């Protein structure tokens, strides 16, 4: 199971964020992330914790090998206001919600 | 790809509920598809797939026995059912299309339909 | 490139010769195409075969450029040398000496022969 | 000073992909187009090298499941096509001497077939088992094949028994063979040995239950691309084989039915003597034995204090659900639900009641059906259950037991079983290298 | 006997070639395994000759060990000939040169067309 | 022409091989006869190129006659060079030697492999 | 007809012509052909008159 | 009025799944895929 952290946080447009993913068992680099717009159905981003799907800007990049694995989108926009969620393998992880301050 | 899925529902406590799931634009023998449901202000979380291609199926252990989901290859849809709804049941069922076995790859999700058990 | 040199000078011409020498030789499903593939293969392979089995006859095998001992009858060409390898391509000389080329062939092999035997008499 | 040299013959090898010739030592497999194999196979052990296998990403299985199903629609095409079977069957339920096992699975159908004269008809009955006819809403039935896909009748002079079959790489190209007895599928492999042929491998055809396979040498192997994925099947190649016995005691009795000019179609007629219910036996004792080894070797990567469970197949088409084989030219579907039924915690045999189909979707293709024709006489089995097609349920609740259950389908897992530890290279002959030489 | 010497040292492996340089080459039905069959006869035939083509046009046709005359660039490996051939075996080696050999071959043909170039002016 | 000096004395036979040698070698659709013509043409060049490859392992690509320095064992024939040479052809030589074949060819490998170290040593 | 119960007869097709055109069996290259040009050959046996083709 | 007559309605009974089963169905030919025999009969 993951302990996607931490569970919200404030951040202004533009500003880098990283979301920790500390994980329980050894995932390597299966782990994936996911963006769940209030509402819409969620969205994938990064599968691999490197490579990007088509269609996503080149802002959001991962990280990790091990049990620990990070998630950066640079420069926040306010499109980019959503839920983040982890996913390695079967297993999801809490999400967290990024507010505009 | 598309992913349609059925329409809001609503059931008594006790009684069981078919979800379906609709996937056209795509082969549908070569991707696994999964149902992930969300409670309301919860995580997601997984309940199981089944492979198109022979009607396999892998559930979760928590919703082991409650659910069966088939397929029909003709009518290209798959459909889920939950049994002995309980109040907690209450949220938004997804099917997922996992592109690639190694790094589960849900590229494609449905619209979403609530289950609402009530009294 | 490949055939580059071909309006180029016959000495010139002569000196480049892997370039388009190398290009010569470079599952399986029977439809339209894949049959169509493996009669352009076989035949790429069998006439590098054909040409490197006529070099290795004449005793020149793994040669661009070699000699021959057999002498060259004046009829094959009276054109001097200096005009063949200076104002002038190799097109227009397989033109003026093709139908000669299938004698000398023969006595290319013939002379061959009696070297190899001469070899073997002399080692 | 120092210079190039070239060396024609050295030995270097890249992977790479190519096709595999077929060697054996009429049937569906034509084993008889085949090279014959050398009588004394060579094999070149090599020291000091190490390679990189990967049984899940090998390109030998894919060829292998490519021209298994080549050989099996070149063997069906020749032969009788029953587009005139699919008519409305007048069907009754078959009572004279059933035991309480079969009650209903036989269907006595009597239909009107086209004789060898175009305009005259013919009303001739059948004996159709209960998966092969569907009701239309003595009853109406029809095939269950008819409105997916055209039947072809599996042609009687073939055998459907497994010839063993080598596949040999073209000169130029080598097969590395892995003789770590500990190789658990993916990674390096410190003990590599070039051949030109694999060791007779037998296209047995089964789902849950791998049937007269080639067994591991020091113990139980546990076999899986990601163990904790749980959309990948886990193999499980046992060092010591577990006997199955088959039987069919049914004493059938084929009618041939001129349906056309030269077109025969063989139907199923009276049992004679006693109608039994197909089934299987494997011996208590050793299957227990079996899965407590495989449990031994299943925990080392859940941990030591976790449950292992074996449970039955959880969903799906009668394929995966239950064990399906085919031997003696009939095709069983085994419900063992016996066999996974327990729990570990750290002369009786287990019968599985079979049945039998005739109209087989063999290959998972919508579009091309087969109807098997009866097999004269009482058909007995003999099999080794070399390995098996585990799958892990998902998700983590707070136990900590983990529930395997058999799987199959996919004929790659099945042939993947026999190709794990083999891998083909292509040969580089030409290398340069420093040397201290001028041509004069 | 066939890639026995594959982990063998380098001057070890030199030493013994054509064991495993034989194998390199060793009614017609269209069926599954015919076609089979006929596409891996094809493919050895091609693959042997391409690989005798290289070696012909470096001068070293008929030569399992060939000299050269082109100079060797030390960026493409500064490693001493003594490890090189006595503590490491052929396949590490073509790892660290597989990306400087296409340049190489380049140079091997080329010094082959003009040291044959010079034989036909002294010859 | 070809096959022409095969009765003729072992001699008179090794001194003309050219015309015997030439012969060896010299769209698609997949009726009967055309699945015929490409085994033939696959099975033509196979044959031609183990064949060559058998000559060039010795040492001998590109000679009809090669030398070889390898002993030759009394137990294989004990007949004189006289009588092998001038009563008697080719075909009955065949017949009394082919079950020495298989050892001889690989003594002429090793020979050449042998001497081509002692060249690159020497060299 | 009466090939109607044991096989499926398929009509010989009008285009066609069986006249007999002579063919030439030619063996593939690095093959020959051995022509016994013995008059006095019954068939079985060694053939003093031999000519390659 | 470009199109007065260029589609046809034809209705016609097919064989269905069943061999002894017929089945009449509808379709839209259009003019230049259907010639008349001599509703009307249309082939
Ligand atoms: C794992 O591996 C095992 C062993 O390799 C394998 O078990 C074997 O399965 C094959 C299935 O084909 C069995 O072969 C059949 O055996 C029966 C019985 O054989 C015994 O009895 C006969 C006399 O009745 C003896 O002569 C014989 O030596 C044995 O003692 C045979 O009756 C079968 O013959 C028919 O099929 C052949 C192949 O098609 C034909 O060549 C033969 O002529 C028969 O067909 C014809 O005759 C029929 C009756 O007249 C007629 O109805 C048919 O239409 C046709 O005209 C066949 O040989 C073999 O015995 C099994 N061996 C053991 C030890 O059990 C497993 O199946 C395998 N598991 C897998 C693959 O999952
Ligand atoms: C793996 O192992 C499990 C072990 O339980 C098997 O589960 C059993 O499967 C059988 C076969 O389908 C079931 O038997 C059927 O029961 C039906 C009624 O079930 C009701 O009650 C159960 C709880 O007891 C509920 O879960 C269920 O939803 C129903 O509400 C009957 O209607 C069926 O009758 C049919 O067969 C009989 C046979 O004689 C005929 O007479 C009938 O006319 C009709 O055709 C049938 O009896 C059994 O209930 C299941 N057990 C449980 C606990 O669920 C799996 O099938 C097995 N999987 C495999 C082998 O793939
Ligand atoms: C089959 O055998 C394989 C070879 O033994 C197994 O692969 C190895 O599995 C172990 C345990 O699962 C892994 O150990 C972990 O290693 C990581 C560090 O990763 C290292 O390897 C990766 C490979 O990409 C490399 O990129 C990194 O830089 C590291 O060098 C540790 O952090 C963990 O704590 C743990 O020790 C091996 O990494 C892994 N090796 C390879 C090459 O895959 C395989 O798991 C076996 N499969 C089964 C089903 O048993
Ligand atoms: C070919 O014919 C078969 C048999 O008639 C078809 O399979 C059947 O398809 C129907 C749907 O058209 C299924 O009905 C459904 O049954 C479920 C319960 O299983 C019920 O909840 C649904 O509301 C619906 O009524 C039927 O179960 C199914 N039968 C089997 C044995 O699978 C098949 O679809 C046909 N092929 C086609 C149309 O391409
Ligand atoms: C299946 O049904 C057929 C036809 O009903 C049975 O065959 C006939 O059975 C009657 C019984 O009175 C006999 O008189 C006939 O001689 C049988 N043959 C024919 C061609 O009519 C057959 O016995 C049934 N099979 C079963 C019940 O297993
Ligand atoms: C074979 O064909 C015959 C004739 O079409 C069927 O017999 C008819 O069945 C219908 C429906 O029951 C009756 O209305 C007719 O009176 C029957 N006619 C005759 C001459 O018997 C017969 O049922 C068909 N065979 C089967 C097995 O259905
Ligand atoms: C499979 O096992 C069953 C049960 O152990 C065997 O059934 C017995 O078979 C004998 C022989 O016909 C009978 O005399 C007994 O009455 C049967 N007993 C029961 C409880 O069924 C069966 O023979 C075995 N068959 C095979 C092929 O292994
Ligand atoms: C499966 O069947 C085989 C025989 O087909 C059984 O093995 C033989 O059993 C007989 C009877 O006791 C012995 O005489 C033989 O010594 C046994 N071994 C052989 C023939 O190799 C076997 O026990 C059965 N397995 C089951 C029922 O699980
Ligand atoms: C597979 O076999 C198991 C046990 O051998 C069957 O389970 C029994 O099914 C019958 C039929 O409904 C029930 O009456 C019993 O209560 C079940 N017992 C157990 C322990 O599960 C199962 O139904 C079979 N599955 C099939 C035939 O599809
Ligand atoms: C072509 O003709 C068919 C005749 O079946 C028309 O389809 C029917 O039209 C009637 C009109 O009253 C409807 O009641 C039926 O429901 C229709 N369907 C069937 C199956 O009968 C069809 O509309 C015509 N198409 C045209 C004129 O474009
Ligand atoms: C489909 O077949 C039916 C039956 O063969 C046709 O209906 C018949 O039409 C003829 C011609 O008018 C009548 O004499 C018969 O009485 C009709 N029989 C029945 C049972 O209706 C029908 O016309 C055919 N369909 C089409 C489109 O031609
Ligand atoms: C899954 O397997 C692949 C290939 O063997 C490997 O690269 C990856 O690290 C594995 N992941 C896990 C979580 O075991
Ligand atoms: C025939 O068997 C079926 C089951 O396949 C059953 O539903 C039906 O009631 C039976 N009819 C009888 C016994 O008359
Ligand atoms: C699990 O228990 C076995 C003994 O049954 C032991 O050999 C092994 O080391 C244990 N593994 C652990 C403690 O991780
Ligand atoms: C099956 O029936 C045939 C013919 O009656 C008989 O010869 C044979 O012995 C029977 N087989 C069995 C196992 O009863
Ligand atoms: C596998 O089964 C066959 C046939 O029953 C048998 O001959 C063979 O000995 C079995 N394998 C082993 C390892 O015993
Ligand atoms: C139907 O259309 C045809 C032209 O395709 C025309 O000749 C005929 O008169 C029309 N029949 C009507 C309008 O009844």
């Known amino acids: 199971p993951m302990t996607q952290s931490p569970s919200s946080l404030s951040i202004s447009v533009g500003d880098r964020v990283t979301i920790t993913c500390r994980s329980s068992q050894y995932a390597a680099h299966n782990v994936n992330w996911y963006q769940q717009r209030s509402g819409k159905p969620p969205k994938l981003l990064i599968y691999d914790t490197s490579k990007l799907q088509a269609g996503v800007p080149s802002r959001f990049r991962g990280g990790g090998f091990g049990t620990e694995f990070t998630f950066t989108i640079s420069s926040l926009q306010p499109e980019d206001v959503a839920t983040y969620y982890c996913?390695?393998?079967?297993?999801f992880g809490q999400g967290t919600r990024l507010e505009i301050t | 790809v598309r992913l349609m899925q059925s329409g809001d529902e609503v059931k008594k406590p006790g009684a069981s509920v078919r979800l379906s799931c609709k996937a056209d634009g795509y082969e549908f023998s070569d991707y696994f598809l999964h149902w992930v449901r969300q409670a309301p202000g919860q995580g997601l979380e997984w309940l199981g797939f089944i492979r198109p291609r022979l009607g396999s199926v892998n559930y979760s252990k928590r919703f082991q026995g409650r659910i069966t989901m088939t397929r029909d290859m003709s009518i290209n849809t798959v459909y889920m059912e939950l049994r002995s709804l309980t109040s907690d049941d209450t949220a938004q069922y997804y099917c997922?299309?996992?592109?690639?076995?190694?790094?589960?790859?849900?590229?494609?999700w449905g619209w979403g339909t609530v289950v609402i058990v009530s009294s | 490139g490949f055939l580059g040199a071909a309006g180029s000078t016959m000495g010139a011409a002569s000196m480049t010769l892997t370039v388009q020498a190398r290009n010569l030789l470079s599952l399986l499903k029977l439809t339209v195409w894949g049959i169509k593939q493996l009669q352009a293969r076989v035949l790429a392979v069998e006439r590098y075969l054909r040409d490197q089995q006529l070099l290795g006859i004449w005793g020149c095998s793994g040669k661009l450029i070699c000699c021959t001992n057999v002498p060259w009858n004046s009829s094959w060409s009276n054109r001097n040398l200096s005009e063949i390898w200076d104002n002038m391509t190799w097109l227009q000389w397989d033109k003026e000496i093709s139908n000669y080329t299938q004698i000398i062939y023969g006595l290319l092999e013939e002379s061959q022969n009696q070297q190899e035997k001469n070899e073997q008499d002399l080692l | 000073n120092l210079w190039v040299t070239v060396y024609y013959g050295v030995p270097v090898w890249k992977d790479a992909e190519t096709t595999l010739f077929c060697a054996s030592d009429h049937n569906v497999w034509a084993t008889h187009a085949c090279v014959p194999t050398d009588p004394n196979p060579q094999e070149i052990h090599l020291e000091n090298v190490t390679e990189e296998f990967n049984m899940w990403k090998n390109n030998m299985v894919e060829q292998m499941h490519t021209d298994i199903i080549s050989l099996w629609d070149q063997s069906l095409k020749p032969c009788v096509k029953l587009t005139p079977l699919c008519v409305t069957l007048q069907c009754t339920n078959v009572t004279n001497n059933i035991t309480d096992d079969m009650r209903g699975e036989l269907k006595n159908c009597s239909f009107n077939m086209t004789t060898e004269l175009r305009d005259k008809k013919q009303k001739v009955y059948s004996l159709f088992y209960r998966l092969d006819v569907v009701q239309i809403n003595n009853k109406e039935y029809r095939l269950i094949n008819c409105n997916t896909s055209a039947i072809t009748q599996a042609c009687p002079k073939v055998s459907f028994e497994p010839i063993p079959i080598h596949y040999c790489a073209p000169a130029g190209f080598a097969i590395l063979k892995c003789k770590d007895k500990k190789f658990n599928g993916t990674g390096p492999c410190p003990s590599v040995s070039t051949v030109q042929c694999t060791h007779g491998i037998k296209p047995v055809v089964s789902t849950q239950l791998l049937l007269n396979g080639s067994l591991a040498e020091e113990e139980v192997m546990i076999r899986s691309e990601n163990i904790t994925n749980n959309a990948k099947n886990i193999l499980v190649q046992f060092n010591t084989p577990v006997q199955i016995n088959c039987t069919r005691p049914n004493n059938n009795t084929r009618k041939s039915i001129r349906i056309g000019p030269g077109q025969a179609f063989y139907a199923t007629g009276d049992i004679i003597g006693d109608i039994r219910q197909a089934h299987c036996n494997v011996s208590k004792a050793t299957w227990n034995e079996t899965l407590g080894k495989v449990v031994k070797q299943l925990r080392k990567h859940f941990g030591n204090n976790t449950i292992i469970r074996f449970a039955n197949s959880s969903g799906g088409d009668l394929e995966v659900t239950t064990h399906s084989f085919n031997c003696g030219g009939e095709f069983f579907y085994c419900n063992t639900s016996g066999l996974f039924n327990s729990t570990w915690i750290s002369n009786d045999s287990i019968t599985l009641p079979c049945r039998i189909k005739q109209i087989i979707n063999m290959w998972q293709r919508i579009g091309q059906a087969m109807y098997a024709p009866p097999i004269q006489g009482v058909i007995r089995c003999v099999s080794n259950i070399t390995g098996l097609i585990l799958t892990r349920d998902g998700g983590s609740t707070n136990s900590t037991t983990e529930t395997f259950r058999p799987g199959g389908g996919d004929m790659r897992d099945n042939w993947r079983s026999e190709l794990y530890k083999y891998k083909v290279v292509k040969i580089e002959p030409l290398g340069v290298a420093p040397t201290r030489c001028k041509r004069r | 006997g066939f890639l026995g010497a594959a982990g063998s040292t380098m001057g070890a492996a030199s030493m013994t070639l054509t064991v495993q340089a034989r194998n390199l080459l060793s009614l017609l039905k269209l069926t599954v395994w015919g076609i089979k069959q006929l596409q891996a006869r094809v493919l050895a035939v091609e693959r042997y000759l391409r690989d005798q083509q290289l070696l012909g046009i470096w001068g070293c046709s008929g030569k399992l060990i060939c000299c050269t005359n082109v100079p060797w660039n030390s960026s493409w490996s500064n490693r001493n000939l003594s490890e090189i051939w006595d503590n490491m075996t052929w396949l590490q080696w073509d790892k660290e040169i597989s990306n400087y050999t296409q340049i190489i071959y380049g140079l091997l043909e080329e010094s082959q067309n003009q040291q044959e170039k010079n034989e036909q002016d002294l010859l | 022409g070809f096959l022409g000096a095969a009765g003729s004395t072992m001699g008179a036979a090794s001194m003309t091989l050219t015309v015997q040698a030439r012969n060896l070698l010299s769209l698609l659709k997949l009726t009967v006869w055309g699945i015929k013509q490409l085994q033939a043409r696959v099975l033509a060049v196979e044959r031609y190129l183990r064949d060559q490859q058998l000559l060039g392992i010795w040492g001998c690509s590109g000679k009809l006659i090669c030398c070889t320095n390898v002993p030759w064992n009394s137990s294989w024939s004990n007949r004189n060079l006289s009588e092998i040479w001038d009563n008697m052809t080719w075909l009955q030589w065949d017949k009394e030697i082919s079950n020495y074949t298989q050892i001889i060819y690989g003594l002429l490998e090793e020979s050449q492999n042998q001497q081509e170290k002692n060249e690159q040593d020497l060299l | 007809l009466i090939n109607c119960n044991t096989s499926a007869i398929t009509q010989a097709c009008p285009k066609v012509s069986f006249e007999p055109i002579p063919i030439h069996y030619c063996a593939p290259a690095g093959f020959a052909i051995l022509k016994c040009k013995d008059k006095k050959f019954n068939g079985t046996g060694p053939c003093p008159s031999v000519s390659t083709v | 009025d470009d199109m007065r007559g260029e589609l046809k309605n034809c209705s016609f009974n097919m064989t269905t799944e069943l061999r002894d089963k017929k089945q009449k169905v509808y379709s839209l030919f259009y003019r230049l895929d259907v010639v008349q025999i001599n509703n009307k009969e249309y082939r």
């Open positions: 996913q390695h393998y079967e297993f």
């Open positions: 997922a299309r996992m592109y690639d076995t190694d790094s589960y790859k849900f590229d494609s």
